[PDB]
Design a protein around this ligand. Structure first.
Ligand code: HEM
Ligand SMILES: *Cc1c(COP(=O)(O)O)cnc(C)c1O
Length: 488
């Protein structure tokens, strides 16, 4: 159980500790034996334009963890845990490392396992995040998929099934970044020390986001031991219970911060204040870091920046603040880096490039007229019949609904062909097995410029009725847009 209470007896400035102490990971001045020894020693860069544009009088330095060789801060822990395991004899050559995370920790453990010749197996359902799949497959990791709906309570969830797979595979191990002292200890021993030395002893506030609390708790313990007056600020997104002030749990786009449980490695006694963030301000702040500061970073970095800017309004000029930037743009290239993805989610407004289009740009989809496709029921149509229908369909998609009103899922030719070839779906089986539960849905009241912008990637868009119970209306493609534009 990752949510169990911690048994750690540490108190401030305590001497004798059972844990290992790793000061430095390697020496850049001479030849390094492996890429893992290059983890850490990341630069602390000043923010120049962003704080002065926001009227902040004090100094703000970003510790860049996207410059680690794996691309994230998680390298630090992925090494450390493994290291400690190897000193306990738990890790042998030929061992298989299993971790229940879809985040950057899987990439760190995949890289370290590649260096050490360990098999690596990562468990994540569906796609929560993508472009990390290519990186994990490139590093030699096996990826196991589960149902994405199952809560971490459910056995179908990635954690429980990760333990089941651990029991199935002989002589395997789970490092469990949530319960592992190596996670906070890596930042206690190294990250916090690097920040302390680089600041030359002058540091006042430290802002970081906590997914697992490892970073903020390790740096909080070490820095609070070195500088008792330091203020440690944690950043949690809306929809996560990590904040001691909470209440339900929501859905946010920003990856890497917040959880629906309270990890063991997170020590909330060293957290002075919690700041809550939203996807919009966070992601636009990350784009702001990239644009104004030339720092290529992820969304959690933007969340850190927004929290720090909220706190720093009244902070006097002589103080220094340090914020942690956990990872880089690599994973997010198609999500918050893309203007299309930003305008789709509503985080940016689509701009009308040609003034000729100005008349139909703000018109609603309601002015359009398109077919309302019959909603098929559950467990009726065989795939043969659905091959026929998809061939004959206007927009070449099928709609499956149990309620006859709201659309439960969709059927596409690509998913169907994938499942038929892989053997998951026999020809005479039911198409509901190949159903796609995630899909693009747009309110009936949206403007035609938004729809035309979304259609540049998605060939189809499901229109739902915002006034009555998100009721299914019809499917819209670029044919309807051209037909509305040209015939005026
Ligand atoms: C003098 C310093 C410290 C002492 C005396 C101490 C004591 C302990 C002990 C005895 C355990 C064993 C838990 C068990 O047997 O179930 C433990 C676990 C742990 N320690 Fe420490 N510790 C110290 C420093 C630290 C530091 C600096 C960190 C993080 C930066 C840390 C993080 C943890 C964590 C996350 C656990 C896991 C708790 C669990 O497994 O339930 N400790 N600690
Ligand atoms: C893990 C992670 C965090 C949070 O780091 P913690 O050690 O969980 O406090 C923030 N951003 C990203 C991208 C992460 O992977």
């Amino acid at each position: 159980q990752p949510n169990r209470p911690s048994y750690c007896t540490w108190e401030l400035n305590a001497t004798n500790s059972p844990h290992t102490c790793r000061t430095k990971n390697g020496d850049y001045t001479k030849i390094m034996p492996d890429i893992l020894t290059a983890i850490g020693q990341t630069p602390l860069i000043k923010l120049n334009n962003i704080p002065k544009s926001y009227g902040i009088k004090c100094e703000i330095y970003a510790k860049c963890e996207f410059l680690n060789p794996g691309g994230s801060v998680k390298d630090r822990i992925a090494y450390r845990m493994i290291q400690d395991a190897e000193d306990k004899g738990l890790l042998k050559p030929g061992c298989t490392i299993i971790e229940p995370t879809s985040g950057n920790t899987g990439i760190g453990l995949a890289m370290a396992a590649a260096v050490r010749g360990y098999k690596c197996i990562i468990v994540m359902p569906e796609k929560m995040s993508d472009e990390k799949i290519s990186t994990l497959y490139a590093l030699g990791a096996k990826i196991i998929r589960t149902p994405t709906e199952a809560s971490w309570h459910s056995p179908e969830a990635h954690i429980s099934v990760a333990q089941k797979l651990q029991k199935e595979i002989p002589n395997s191990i789970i490092l469990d970044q949530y319960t592992n002292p190596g996670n906070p200890l890596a930042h206690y021993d190294q990250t916090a020390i690097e920040i302390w030395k680089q600041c030359e002893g002058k540091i006042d506030y430290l802002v970081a986001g906590a997914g697992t609390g490892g970073t903020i708790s390790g740096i909080g313990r070490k820095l609070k031991e070195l500088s008792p007056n330091i203020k440690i600020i944690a950043v949690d997104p809306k929809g996560s219970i990590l904040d001691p002030s909470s209440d339900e749990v929501g859905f946010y786009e920003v990856e890497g911060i917040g959880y629906d449980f309270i990890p063991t490695v997170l020590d909330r006694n060293v957290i002075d204040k919690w700041i809550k963030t939203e996807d919009n301000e966070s992601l636009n702040a990350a784009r702001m870091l990239i644009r104004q500061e030339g720092l290529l970073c992820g969304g959690s970095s933007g969340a850190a920046l927004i929290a720090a800017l909220k706190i720093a309004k009244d902070i006097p000029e002589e103080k220094r603040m340090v914020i942690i930037l956990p990872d880089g743009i690599r994973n997010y290239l198609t999500k918050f880096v893309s203007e299309y993805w930003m305008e789709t989610r509503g985080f940016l407004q689509p701009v009308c490039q040609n003034e000729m289009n100005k008349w139909w740009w703000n018109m609603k989809i309601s002015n359009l007229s398109f077919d309302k496709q019959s909603l098929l029921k559950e467990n009726t149509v065989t795939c043969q019949e659905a091959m026929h229908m998809l061939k004959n369909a206007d927009s070449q998609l099928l709609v499956i609904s149990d309620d006859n009103i709201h659309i439960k899922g969709v059927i596409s030719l690509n998913k169907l062909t994938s499942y038929v070839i892989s053997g998951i779906v026999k020809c005479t089986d039911f198409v509901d097995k190949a159903m796609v539960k995630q899909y693009v849905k747009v309110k009936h009241s949206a403007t035609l410029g938004y729809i035309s912008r979304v259609l540049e990637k998605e060939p189809y868009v499901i229109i739902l009725d915002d006034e009555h119970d998100d009721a299914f209306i019809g499917i819209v493609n670029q044919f309807h847009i051209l037909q509305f534009i040209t015939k005026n």
